[PDB]
DNA sequence: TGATAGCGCTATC
DNA sequence: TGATAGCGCTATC
């Protein structure tokens with residue numbers, strides 16, 4: 259993340275729905291806002307969130323009396339995506355984990371906050387022909403909210419990672435918000451090799467497979483894109499290797515392969531997966547953030563998360579719009 | 586409330 | 599297309 263000195267969200271309160279690792283909290287908090295509630299049901303997420311924020315989120319949002327949710331100005335929610343991901347089956351709303359948006363809507367109905375800040379994978383925008391996003395768009399509009407939605411890639415915001423997510427920002431119509439805008443992109447100046455730990459602390463992630471097939475030569479000139487250097491086995495998810503002089507492929511939560519959830523990388527002639535700390539950095543998390551003790555859950559936790567940086571710029575801009583109230 | 590690893594399909598240009 | 603990347607799926611221990 260980056261430091262934000264002109265704190266745009268200073269007096270605002272916000273709720274952390276589907277808290278996960280709390281990336282939404284770090285971002286809005288860096289803009290001056292205040293977290294008055296968190297919700298997340300995964301026992302391990304709850305522990306990492308307690309470890310870092312001293313709070314344990316409430317459980318399963320599905321059976322939480324919405325009226326119980328504390329008054330708040332911005333509702334943040336990075337809702338489940340398995341049901342909309344290009345990487346899964348795609349049953350959308352027909353999936354158990356696909357109905358969560360309607361929980362957001364109903365919390366929005368009761369608490370009607372000033373802004374609604376949501377996040378999902380790029381394919382949520384095309385899922386079921388555009389039906390999912392339209393239903394979402396209509397539900398929000400139907401609640402007296404605007405609905406600004408756009409796809410932003412992590413790599414365009416200073417983080418060496420390919421992560422294309424849809425950000426949906428809704429302001430109550432009351433507010434008459436007509437100046438909202440998504441952060442303008444900017445030149446990437448950091449790449450994987452920059453966030454990499456010293457070889458000493460990562461020996462153990464190095465994997466030497468006889469079936470490692472190098473298909474491309476390493477690169478010396480940095481590029482804001484994922485450059486595949488080789489594969490292992492058949493080359494499926496988690497079985498492909500990339501140059502650290504490019505950007506990181508996206509991290510995943512249930513991902514598999516020998517380079518599970520991280521993908522492989524060629525570091526000094528060796529081939530390894532990222533350490534949970536490198537995942538933190540690739541998601542823009544600060545080194546002060548305490549990772550969960552279970553590397554597996556840590557990886558799952560980081561793979562479900564959001565790139566903080568992106569969120570900061572959006573949060574600043576939400577604050578910027580909200581703040582322009584001339585005479 | 587678990588850790589690991591081989592998928593095997595889709596969306597995109 | 600032809601090659602890649604995907605906040606995934608799911609069997610086995």
Ligand SMILES: Nc1ncnc2c1ncn2[C@@H]1O[C@H](CSCC[C@H](N)C(=O)O)[C@@H](O)[C@H]1O
Nearest residue numbers: 276278279281282298299318319336562563
């Ligand atoms: N019914 C439910 N109640 C609470 N949390 C839920 C839930 N269904 C899914 N979740 C959680 O919602 C998250 C989807 S991922 C979001 C991660 C979050 N943006 C962060 O910044 O890391 C996961 O943590 C998942 O465990």
